Structure formats: structure tokens, C-alpha cells
Amino acid sequence: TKTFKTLDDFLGTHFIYTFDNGWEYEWYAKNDHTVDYRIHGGMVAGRWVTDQKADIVMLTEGIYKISWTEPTGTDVALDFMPNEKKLHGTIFFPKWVEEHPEITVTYQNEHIDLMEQSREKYATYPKLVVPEFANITYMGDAGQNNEDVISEAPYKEMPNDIRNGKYFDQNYHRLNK
Amino acid sequence: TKTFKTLDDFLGTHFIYTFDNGWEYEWYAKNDHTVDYRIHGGMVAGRWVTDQKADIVMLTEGIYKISWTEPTGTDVALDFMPNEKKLHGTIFFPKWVEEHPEITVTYQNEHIDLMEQSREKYATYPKLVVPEFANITYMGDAGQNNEDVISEAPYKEMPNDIRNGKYFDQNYHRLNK
């Protein structure tokens, strides 16, 4: 297992992680300012997002912090500690996302206007704040700017397919896309 | 100087820090779920807050993450790296706080209703997201649950008074309060 020391070590890494409640999330550091993600379990299982702009920094050797805000109004602060196979995420959900999470369950890129309309129409407060650790179960070196990594909706056995080496080819690409 | 290793090492620490723009912020880990803070420069110079409830965790040895949301609607994710005298903060401001920051410039504890009224009345989007590093210029061991640490509005030379040993007595209390 490789040791993460620099920002470059972190960028291009594709993660799957599990929270204490069993929910499985998936996230990819596509480049130094862009993230893709995909949700496999829980409140927003089925949601996936590409080309989300984010602030990505190294806090200190091997520790990385990512900050972004969403078309839905959700704020996210993620901290990766990959050398310890640990993540800490804080999600600040607007009230409406807690009330109607299914609205956000889609390929967001095709429904940006709907997210923006919803965040103005429905309630923002009180926010649901979710600060939780997760255990990282998969770390793949996808390289940077790999558009295949998160390129379709999640399906039931997808995380297993990824971990078992059945999803990506030798170059971290999809044979059929 | 002391090395921070545990959550207990961190709790009770009183910090002053400076951003690249020269703005000076002050923050106190009062206990494992409560923070006080005070703003000396910039946008909201003059703002101070006590008894803000927050999530406080140790990410890994000597690295601490604090998450909270405010009566104004602002979301905050702070990461302290005290062994390196470094901090990284992400503040997610609602649009209205960017537009009318002076509304938040007060002792917030006496004006909670006003903050809540404002966050519903004015615009939330687009958010102003401010992710930046700061240099820590002061770390004091105040102990936990010390109500003297942040107990008045900021004044011009206050950070200097604190750093110069002119503000607190030998027990980290105010002689006159």
C-alpha cells in the first residue's frame, strides 16, 4: 500500500467508504479543483454528480481537505486521512433536502435548474448537519481527469465490482461506456 | 513548546490567528461541544459569539476538526494544526451575510431572533464560500469552561493585550469583568 504525502499523491484517487450506519459513498478527486461522486446507500442512494467544482488543499503531510457547495444549497467539508483509511465528512443539508431527499436522487448534471428552483422554493432552516467518520474500503489510482470513473448511475453490486477488479480495465477505463 | 497529541490537549485552548489579507480572528475551544469566538478585522470586525454548539473531533494525532452552523445560516468547518501553528477554515456564508455583513456585527447572543429573521427575509444564494489558511499567532491554555476568555466586544489593541500578558491574570481570568 502506497503512502500519501503530497497533494499530487492524493489527486486522481478514487475512494469508496462506509459510515457507521452502513451507508456506502464514493468520491473521486478528478483534478485539483474538481470532484465527482456517487451515492450507494441511505437517504440519497442513487444520486451521482460529476464536475463539481471544489477547493482542495493539503492540510499537512497526508491529510487533505475538500470544500464545496451544491446546486441544492448543500455545503460539504471532507477531510481524507488515506494513510489511516479514514475520512471525516461534514454535510450541511438545507431543511428541504432532509424533507425531500428524493428530489436530489438523480444525475444532478441534467437537473441543475430543478435543484436551484427547489432551494429557493422550499425551506432552508433548520439545517441538518451530519459530521461523521467513515472507513475507506477502496482506494484506486484512477489518474487525473479520467471521465470513466464516475460515468453512470450506481447499481446494486457496483462497489463489489470495482473492488473485485471487474469494473475497470488495466488502464482504469470502462471497456463498455 | 507543548506538542498537541490528544483531543484533551486541544480542548481549552484559546487561539488568535491571521489570514493572508491581515484579518485577525479569535476562537476558543470551551469544551468538547462548545466554542466562543471574536472577530478583530475585516467583513465582520466587531462580531463576537459565546456558547456556539459545535462538533469537535480529532481527525488524527494533533489535528482537530470543528463543524458548526450559525443563527445567521452560516456554516463553518475549521481544521486546526496547532503543532504547525496553522489553521484552515471554510466559511459558507449565505448571500445576505455577504450583502449586509454589518447586521451580524454585534454580540450575537443578544440578537438571535434578529439573525433568524434576517436569514429567512433575505437571499441565501449564491453562497460566499471562503476556504483559507491562517497563521496562528497566539495559543493560550485557558482550561475548559472558562467564561472569561471571550466575555466582551473586541477593542483595537485587544490581541496585543492578550499576547503581551496584559489581559488575563495568572489563572487566565479577567481581573475586572
XYZ file of N, CA, C and O in Angstrom, chain B:
708
model
N 7.968 24.308 23.031
C 6.527 24.493 23.372
C 5.842 23.128 23.473
O 6.445 22.101 23.141
N 4.590 23.115 23.930
C 3.844 21.868 24.092
C 3.457 21.260 22.739
O 3.188 21.980 21.772
N 3.450 19.931 22.684
C 3.026 19.198 21.497
C 1.589 18.715 21.698
O 1.266 18.101 22.717
N 0.734 19.015 20.725
C -0.665 18.592 20.750
C -0.786 17.189 20.168
O -0.373 16.949 19.032
N -1.350 16.269 20.947
C -1.472 14.871 20.524
C -2.884 14.307 20.676
O -3.318 13.491 19.859
N -3.593 14.742 21.715
C -4.921 14.215 22.040
C -6.001 15.289 21.918
O -5.692 16.480 21.818
N -7.265 14.872 21.943
C -8.371 15.831 21.978
C -8.290 16.693 23.242
O -8.528 17.902 23.191
N -7.928 16.073 24.365
C -7.764 16.815 25.616
C -6.695 17.910 25.544
O -6.842 18.961 26.173
N -5.623 17.665 24.792
C -4.589 18.682 24.585
C -5.175 19.916 23.907
O -4.776 21.048 24.194
N -6.127 19.680 23.008
C -6.717 20.736 22.200
C -7.788 21.510 22.956
O -7.782 22.742 22.944
N -8.705 20.798 23.606
C -9.789 21.456 24.329
C -9.246 22.400 25.397
O -8.248 22.100 26.063
N -9.903 23.547 25.532
C -9.474 24.580 26.469
C -8.433 25.532 25.907
O -7.988 26.448 26.609
N -8.034 25.327 24.651
C -7.042 26.203 24.025
C -7.725 27.409 23.384
O -8.789 27.290 22.765
N -7.095 28.563 23.580
C -7.570 29.854 23.120
C -6.613 30.325 22.027
O -5.412 30.459 22.264
N -7.155 30.556 20.831
C -6.355 30.871 19.646
C -6.611 32.272 19.104
O -7.746 32.748 19.126
N -5.552 32.909 18.603
C -5.687 34.068 17.717
C -4.924 33.737 16.438
O -3.822 33.176 16.493
N -5.515 34.060 15.290
C -4.898 33.743 14.006
C -5.153 34.812 12.955
O -6.146 35.543 13.026
N -4.234 34.889 11.993
C -4.248 35.915 10.955
C -4.285 35.289 9.565
O -3.482 34.406 9.242
N -5.223 35.755 8.747
C -5.327 35.316 7.361
C -4.383 36.131 6.482
O -3.822 37.132 6.933
N -4.203 35.695 5.237
C -3.295 36.363 4.302
C -3.665 37.828 4.041
O -2.789 38.649 3.770
N -4.955 38.148 4.146
C -5.445 39.522 3.985
C -5.232 40.405 5.221
O -5.582 41.589 5.214
N -4.676 39.820 6.281
C -4.372 40.558 7.506
C -5.466 40.530 8.560
O -5.269 41.038 9.666
N -6.615 39.943 8.227
C -7.728 39.867 9.175
C -7.374 38.945 10.335
O -6.805 37.866 10.141
N -7.713 39.390 11.539
C -7.380 38.672 12.756
C -8.644 38.126 13.410
O -9.563 38.880 13.730
N -8.684 36.807 13.585
C -9.820 36.130 14.202
C -9.366 35.454 15.496
O -8.184 35.140 15.668
N -10.314 35.226 16.397
C -10.017 34.681 17.718
C -11.081 33.648 18.069
O -12.263 33.867 17.836
N -10.658 32.520 18.638
C -11.549 31.375 18.801
C -11.084 30.536 19.983
O -9.886 30.396 20.226
N -12.049 29.979 20.706
C -11.774 29.272 21.948
C -12.572 27.971 22.013
O -13.795 27.971 21.873
N -11.853 26.866 22.214
C -12.463 25.550 22.375
C -12.888 25.383 23.829
O -12.153 24.821 24.644
N -14.081 25.873 24.153
C -14.503 25.972 25.555
C -14.705 24.608 26.217
O -14.319 24.399 27.372
N -15.321 23.690 25.484
C -15.412 22.297 25.906
C -15.596 21.424 24.670
O -15.485 21.921 23.548
N -15.874 20.138 24.860
C -15.907 19.214 23.727
C -17.063 19.428 22.734
O -17.123 18.763 21.698
N -17.959 20.367 23.038
C -19.118 20.627 22.174
C -19.511 22.107 22.073
O -20.603 22.428 21.594
N -18.621 22.999 22.516
C -18.937 24.428 22.616
C -17.745 25.299 22.240
O -16.620 25.049 22.682
N -18.004 26.318 21.420
C -16.978 27.278 21.014
C -17.421 28.728 21.229
O -18.607 29.052 21.125
N -16.451 29.581 21.547
C -16.644 31.026 21.604
C -15.698 31.648 20.581
O -14.594 31.135 20.353
N -16.116 32.750 19.962
C -15.230 33.438 19.036
C -15.444 34.942 18.961
O -16.460 35.455 19.435
N -14.464 35.631 18.381
C -14.417 37.090 18.380
C -13.605 37.563 17.177
O -12.514 37.057 16.920
N -14.161 38.521 16.436
C -13.593 38.941 15.152
C -12.996 40.346 15.242
O -13.681 41.292 15.623
N -11.719 40.465 14.887
C -10.983 41.722 15.067
C -10.817 42.551 13.805
O -10.620 43.764 13.886
N -10.880 41.899 12.649
C -10.684 42.592 11.380
C -11.593 42.098 10.277
O -12.172 41.009 10.367
N -11.726 42.924 9.241
C -12.418 42.555 8.015
C -13.923 42.722 7.999
O -14.480 43.525 8.757
N -14.552 41.953 7.106
C -16.004 41.840 6.914
C -16.851 42.147 8.137
O -17.737 43.007 8.110
N -16.585 41.397 9.199
C -17.458 41.373 10.356
C -16.698 41.711 11.638
O -17.032 41.219 12.719
N -15.685 42.568 11.503
C -14.927 43.061 12.650
C -15.897 43.613 13.684
O -16.750 44.448 13.364
N -15.784 43.126 14.918
C -16.699 43.540 15.976
C -17.660 42.456 16.431
O -18.158 42.496 17.558
N -17.937 41.497 15.550
C -18.779 40.352 15.882
C -18.128 39.475 16.948
O -16.930 39.193 16.889
N -18.926 39.048 17.920
C -18.472 38.040 18.868
C -19.639 37.162 19.311
O -20.802 37.576 19.273
N -19.302 35.934 19.701
C -20.265 34.857 19.887
C -19.780 33.998 21.041
O -18.605 33.639 21.101
N -20.689 33.671 21.956
C -20.387 32.701 23.002
C -21.387 31.555 22.963
O -22.516 31.724 22.505
N -20.956 30.389 23.442
C -21.826 29.219 23.609
C -22.388 28.665 22.296
O -23.495 28.113 22.260
N -21.620 28.812 21.218
C -21.981 28.198 19.951
C -21.730 26.696 20.040
O -20.607 26.261 20.302
N -22.779 25.910 19.825
C -22.640 24.461 19.867
C -21.985 23.967 18.580
O -22.285 24.454 17.487
N -21.055 23.031 18.734
C -20.238 22.567 17.620
C -19.837 21.117 17.788
O -19.777 20.602 18.905
N -19.567 20.463 16.666
C -18.970 19.138 16.667
C -17.458 19.299 16.676
O -16.903 20.012 15.840
N -16.794 18.653 17.631
C -15.338 18.740 17.743
C -14.739 17.341 17.780
O -15.056 16.539 18.664
N -13.889 17.045 16.803
C -13.217 15.745 16.747
C -11.723 15.898 16.515
O -11.265 16.918 15.990
N -10.969 14.883 16.922
C -9.595 14.751 16.476
C -9.602 13.873 15.231
O -10.084 12.739 15.271
N -9.099 14.416 14.125
C -9.017 13.677 12.863
C -7.942 12.605 12.937
O -8.135 11.475 12.478
N -6.811 12.994 13.517
C -5.640 12.151 13.708
C -4.753 12.900 14.700
O -5.025 14.063 15.006
N -3.713 12.246 15.216
C -2.874 12.854 16.252
C -2.547 14.318 15.942
O -1.933 14.625 14.919
N -2.994 15.215 16.818
C -2.668 16.630 16.716
C -3.402 17.446 15.668
O -3.023 18.587 15.419
N -4.440 16.872 15.058
C -5.224 17.560 14.022
C -6.697 17.516 14.407
O -7.240 16.442 14.659
N -7.341 18.682 14.444
C -8.680 18.800 15.014
C -9.653 19.494 14.071
O -9.304 20.492 13.437
N -10.872 18.964 13.993
C -11.889 19.497 13.089
C -13.125 19.919 13.866
O -13.639 19.163 14.688
N -13.595 21.132 13.587
C -14.754 21.684 14.261
C -15.788 22.081 13.212
O -15.460 22.771 12.248
N -17.027 21.627 13.402
C -18.128 21.910 12.478
C -19.277 22.568 13.221
O -19.689 22.080 14.269
N -19.803 23.661 12.678
C -21.000 24.266 13.252
C -21.795 25.064 12.248
O -21.298 25.410 11.173
N -23.039 25.350 12.616
C -23.890 26.225 11.835
C -24.469 27.314 12.735
O -24.702 27.084 13.927
N -24.682 28.493 12.163
C -24.965 29.695 12.945
C -26.414 30.171 12.850
O -27.127 29.811 11.908
N -26.858 30.986 13.833
C -28.176 31.618 13.766
C -28.389 32.436 12.491
O -29.528 32.674 12.101
N -27.294 32.851 11.857
C -27.340 33.596 10.594
C -27.514 32.674 9.385
O -27.827 33.133 8.283
N -27.273 31.380 9.588
C -27.303 30.407 8.500
C -25.928 29.991 8.003
O -25.800 29.024 7.254
N -24.899 30.726 8.420
C -23.518 30.423 8.057
C -23.065 29.046 8.560
O -23.342 28.664 9.701
N -22.391 28.303 7.682
C -21.785 27.017 8.020
C -20.279 27.194 8.124
O -19.677 27.920 7.332
N -19.676 26.522 9.098
C -18.244 26.651 9.340
C -17.609 25.279 9.531
O -18.134 24.445 10.273
N -16.492 25.055 8.845
C -15.661 23.881 9.066
C -14.225 24.341 9.281
O -13.570 24.839 8.356
N -13.756 24.191 10.517
C -12.420 24.635 10.906
C -11.517 23.457 11.198
O -11.921 22.523 11.886
N -10.290 23.519 10.691
C -9.295 22.490 10.940
C -8.073 23.131 11.576
O -7.490 24.046 11.002
N -7.705 22.670 12.769
C -6.547 23.211 13.466
C -5.382 22.249 13.382
O -5.536 21.047 13.638
N -4.221 22.794 13.031
C -2.966 22.054 13.027
C -1.993 22.799 13.951
O -1.033 23.411 13.483
N -2.248 22.754 15.275
C -1.540 23.635 16.214
C -0.040 23.378 16.335
O 0.707 24.299 16.663
N 0.395 22.146 16.076
C 1.827 21.829 16.082
C 2.597 22.544 14.974
O 3.823 22.678 15.039
N 1.865 23.011 13.968
C 2.454 23.728 12.843
C 1.999 25.185 12.831
O 2.287 25.926 11.890
N 1.305 25.585 13.898
C 0.775 26.946 14.066
C -0.037 27.380 12.844
O 0.052 28.523 12.380
N -0.832 26.437 12.341
C -1.630 26.632 11.136
C -3.077 26.236 11.386
O -3.364 25.338 12.177
N -3.971 26.918 10.682
C -5.405 26.690 10.741
C -5.914 26.705 9.308
O -5.390 27.450 8.485
N -6.913 25.885 8.995
C -7.665 26.079 7.756
C -9.149 26.184 8.052
O -9.736 25.291 8.658
N -9.751 27.281 7.618
C -11.176 27.476 7.821
C -11.937 27.591 6.522
O -11.498 28.276 5.602
N -13.073 26.905 6.440
C -14.015 27.172 5.366
C -15.286 27.737 5.963
O -15.906 27.119 6.833
N -15.653 28.927 5.507
C -16.898 29.541 5.922
C -17.817 29.586 4.710
O -17.423 30.063 3.646
N -19.031 29.073 4.874
C -20.043 29.127 3.825
C -21.085 30.172 4.240
O -21.986 29.872 5.030
N -20.955 31.392 3.721
C -21.864 32.492 4.067
C -23.113 32.493 3.191
O -22.995 32.403 1.972
N -24.309 32.650 3.793
C -25.459 32.946 2.941
C -25.244 34.270 2.219
O -24.524 35.137 2.725
N -25.862 34.417 1.050
C -25.749 35.640 0.257
C -25.997 36.894 1.091
O -25.271 37.879 0.964
N -27.011 36.854 1.955
C -27.379 38.043 2.721
C -26.287 38.528 3.673
O -26.188 39.725 3.942
N -25.462 37.609 4.171
C -24.367 37.996 5.058
C -23.265 38.689 4.257
O -22.647 39.634 4.742
N -23.037 38.234 3.027
C -22.117 38.926 2.130
C -22.632 40.327 1.775
O -21.850 41.281 1.704
N -23.942 40.437 1.554
C -24.563 41.703 1.154
C -24.651 42.694 2.318
O -24.385 43.892 2.142
N -25.022 42.189 3.496
C -25.236 43.025 4.678
C -24.469 42.504 5.896
O -25.092 42.195 6.910
N -23.123 42.431 5.821
C -22.395 41.787 6.928
C -22.569 42.502 8.266
O -22.501 41.865 9.321
N -22.811 43.811 8.209
C -22.944 44.637 9.410
C -24.075 44.190 10.343
O -24.007 44.407 11.553
N -25.105 43.556 9.782
C -26.198 43.007 10.585
C -25.670 41.973 11.588
O -26.186 41.859 12.702
N -24.633 41.239 11.188
C -24.060 40.192 12.036
C -23.002 40.735 12.998
O -22.513 39.998 13.860
N -22.655 42.015 12.847
C -21.652 42.658 13.696
C -22.308 43.152 14.985
O -22.814 44.280 15.065
N -22.296 42.276 15.984
C -22.944 42.513 17.269
C -22.526 41.391 18.214
O -21.848 40.447 17.791
N -22.909 41.497 19.487
C -22.867 40.340 20.372
C -24.071 39.489 20.004
O -25.198 39.792 20.390
N -23.829 38.433 19.235
C -24.922 37.671 18.640
C -25.906 37.106 19.665
O -27.100 36.998 19.384
N -25.401 36.754 20.846
C -26.224 36.116 21.872
C -27.431 36.948 22.301
O -28.435 36.402 22.751
N -27.328 38.265 22.143
C -28.421 39.171 22.495
C -29.349 39.482 21.316
O -30.301 40.256 21.456
N -29.075 38.871 20.161
C -29.796 39.183 18.923
C -30.061 37.953 18.045
O -30.078 38.058 16.815
N -30.277 36.802 18.680
C -30.528 35.545 17.961
C -31.747 35.648 17.039
O -31.676 35.271 15.867
N -32.854 36.168 17.572
C -34.086 36.341 16.800
C -33.860 37.168 15.539
O -34.369 36.823 14.471
N -33.091 38.249 15.665
C -32.770 39.106 14.526
C -32.001 38.350 13.438
O -32.273 38.528 12.250
N -31.052 37.508 13.847
C -30.292 36.694 12.895
C -31.211 35.726 12.146
O -31.124 35.597 10.921
N -32.096 35.063 12.889
C -33.045 34.107 12.312
C -34.056 34.787 11.393
O -34.394 34.252 10.334
N -34.526 35.967 11.795
C -35.435 36.757 10.961
C -34.770 37.154 9.647
O -35.384 37.065 8.578
N -33.512 37.581 9.735
C -32.757 38.020 8.567
C -32.511 36.882 7.576
O -32.631 37.080 6.364
N -32.184 35.696 8.086
C -31.863 34.566 7.212
C -33.063 34.050 6.417
O -32.894 33.427 5.367
N -34.266 34.320 6.920
C -35.498 33.964 6.215
C -35.964 35.078 5.276
O -36.549 34.803 4.225
N -35.701 36.325 5.668
C -36.144 37.507 4.922
C -35.309 37.764 3.664
O -35.856 38.074 2.602
N -33.991 37.639 3.792
C -33.076 37.979 2.704
C -32.621 36.747 1.913
O -32.977 35.617 2.250
N -31.831 36.984 0.867
C -31.370 35.932 -0.037
C -30.353 35.003 0.611
O -29.525 35.434 1.414
N -30.419 33.727 0.242
C -29.457 32.733 0.712
C -28.407 32.443 -0.361
O -27.253 32.161 -0.048
N -28.812 32.534 -1.627
C -27.964 32.126 -2.742
C -27.668 33.276 -3.702
O -28.492 34.185 -3.850
N -26.481 33.251 -4.345
C -25.410 32.263 -4.166
C -24.606 32.497 -2.890
O -24.440 33.642 -2.461
N -24.112 31.410 -2.301
C -23.284 31.477 -1.096
C -21.917 32.067 -1.402
O -21.385 31.884 -2.498
N -21.351 32.768 -0.422
C -19.955 33.167 -0.480
C -19.156 32.140 0.309
O -19.308 32.030 1.529
N -18.315 31.385 -0.391
C -17.512 30.340 0.241
C -16.068 30.805 0.360
O -15.437 31.190 -0.631
N -15.560 30.773 1.589
C -14.245 31.308 1.911
C -13.393 30.213 2.567
O -13.452 30.022 3.787
N -12.632 29.456 1.750
C -11.720 28.442 2.256
C -10.282 28.950 2.280
O -9.667 29.121 1.224
N -9.746 29.199 3.471
C -8.374 29.695 3.558
C -7.599 29.269 4.792
O -8.170 28.955 5.841
N -6.283 29.252 4.630
C -5.358 29.034 5.722
C -5.160 30.314 6.521
O -5.280 31.422 5.986
N -4.855 30.145 7.804
C -4.425 31.248 8.655
C -3.225 30.815 9.480
O -3.063 29.630 9.775
N -2.388 31.784 9.841
C -1.268 31.553 10.737
C -1.673 31.855 12.171
O -2.220 32.921 12.461
N -1.414 30.905 13.061
C -1.738 31.075 14.474
C -0.632 31.885 15.152
O 0.539 31.508 15.102
N -1.015 32.999 15.773
C -0.056 33.904 16.414
C -0.115 33.814 17.934
O 0.758 34.341 18.628
N -1.157 33.166 18.443
C -1.337 33.010 19.879
C -2.071 31.719 20.196
O -3.095 31.411 19.584
N -1.529 30.975 21.154
C -2.187 29.811 21.722
C -2.027 29.905 23.228
O -0.904 29.930 23.740
N -3.149 30.003 23.929
C -3.134 30.056 25.384
C -3.908 28.891 25.954
O -4.918 28.473 25.388
N -3.428 28.358 27.071
C -4.140 27.304 27.772
C -5.080 27.946 28.785
O -4.679 28.290 29.899
N -6.333 28.110 28.376
C -7.350 28.775 29.183
C -8.042 27.818 30.143
O -8.779 28.246 31.039
N -7.810 26.523 29.945
C -8.622 25.499 30.589
C -10.002 25.451 29.958
O -10.358 26.310 29.140
N -10.785 24.446 30.328
C -12.135 24.301 29.800
C -13.145 25.099 30.610
O -12.923 25.380 31.794
N -14.245 25.473 29.956
C -15.369 26.147 30.607
C -14.959 27.408 31.360
O -15.423 27.675 32.475
N -14.079 28.172 30.724
C -13.608 29.441 31.255
C -14.407 30.567 30.614
O -14.178 30.921 29.459
N -15.355 31.120 31.365
C -16.275 32.117 30.809
C -15.666 33.514 30.628
O -16.299 34.396 30.048
N -14.436 33.702 31.096
C -13.750 34.990 30.980
C -13.067 35.190 29.628
O -12.853 36.329 29.206
N -12.728 34.088 28.953
C -11.896 34.139 27.742
C -12.466 35.092 26.692
O -11.776 36.012 26.242
N -13.721 34.860 26.316
C -14.426 35.707 25.358
C -15.652 36.250 26.079
O -16.715 35.627 26.068
N -15.492 37.404 26.722
C -16.529 37.929 27.610
C -16.811 39.417 27.409
O -17.445 40.057 28.250
N -16.332 39.960 26.292
C -16.623 41.344 25.908
C -16.323 41.553 24.429
O -15.639 40.738 23.799
N -16.842 42.650 23.883
C -16.605 43.011 22.493
C -15.120 43.261 22.248
O -14.400 43.667 23.167
N -14.649 43.023 21.011
C -13.247 43.326 20.734
C -12.977 44.826 20.787
O -13.877 45.630 20.528
N -11.752 45.183 21.151
C -11.280 46.563 21.051
C -9.927 46.566 20.345
O -9.257 45.535 20.274
N -9.531 47.722 19.818
C -8.394 47.806 18.894
C -7.144 46.993 19.286
O -6.702 46.131 18.520
N -6.594 47.254 20.468
C -5.333 46.624 20.891
C -5.500 45.317 21.673
O -4.536 44.825 22.269
N -6.708 44.753 21.663
C -7.004 43.547 22.448
C -6.093 42.338 22.150
O -5.559 41.744 23.090
N -5.909 41.969 20.861
C -4.978 40.864 20.595
C -3.568 41.096 21.154
O -2.971 40.169 21.709
N -3.050 42.317 21.013
C -1.757 42.676 21.599
C -1.762 42.560 23.123
O -0.819 42.024 23.706
N -2.832 43.043 23.756
C -3.001 42.942 25.212
C -2.978 41.489 25.687
O -2.372 41.173 26.716
N -3.636 40.616 24.929
C -3.664 39.188 25.239
C -2.268 38.567 25.095
O -1.769 37.929 26.029
N -1.639 38.780 23.939
C -0.304 38.234 23.666
C 0.777 38.779 24.604
O 1.736 38.068 24.926
N 0.615 40.030 25.037
C 1.580 40.692 25.921
C 1.407 40.377 27.409
O 2.181 40.857 28.239
N 0.397 39.575 27.740
C 0.143 39.170 29.125
C -0.529 40.240 29.969
O -0.463 40.200 31.200
N -1.184 41.192 29.307
C -1.825 42.316 29.987
C -3.337 42.141 30.153
O -3.989 42.930 30.847
N -3.895 41.108 29.525
C -5.343 40.933 29.528
C -5.853 39.982 30.611
O -6.858 40.267 31.274
N -5.172 38.846 30.754
C -5.555 37.821 31.721
C -4.613 37.802 32.917
O -3.432 38.129 32.792
N -5.148 37.405 34.068
C -4.331 37.180 35.258
C -3.661 35.801 35.200
O -3.768 35.094 34.188
N -2.978 35.423 36.281
C -2.201 34.175 36.329
C -3.041 32.902 36.178
O -2.502 31.826 35.894
N -4.350 33.029 36.386
C -5.282 31.907 36.292
C -6.158 31.987 35.045
O -7.183 31.305 34.947
N -5.735 32.826 34.101
C -6.435 33.030 32.830
C -7.834 33.617 33.030
O -8.777 33.282 32.311
N -7.954 34.506 34.012
C -9.208 35.200 34.270
C -9.020 36.698 34.098
O -7.892 37.191 34.074
N -10.133 37.411 33.967
C -10.098 38.867 33.915
C -10.207 39.412 35.329
O -11.097 39.021 36.086
N -9.283 40.303 35.678
C -9.260 40.929 36.997
C -10.530 41.743 37.237
O -11.118 41.684 38.319
N -10.942 42.496 36.220
C -12.200 43.239 36.255
C -13.060 42.851 35.059
O -12.624 42.949 33.906
N -14.278 42.401 35.350
C -15.187 41.868 34.342
C -16.600 42.402 34.555
O -17.177 43.032 33.667
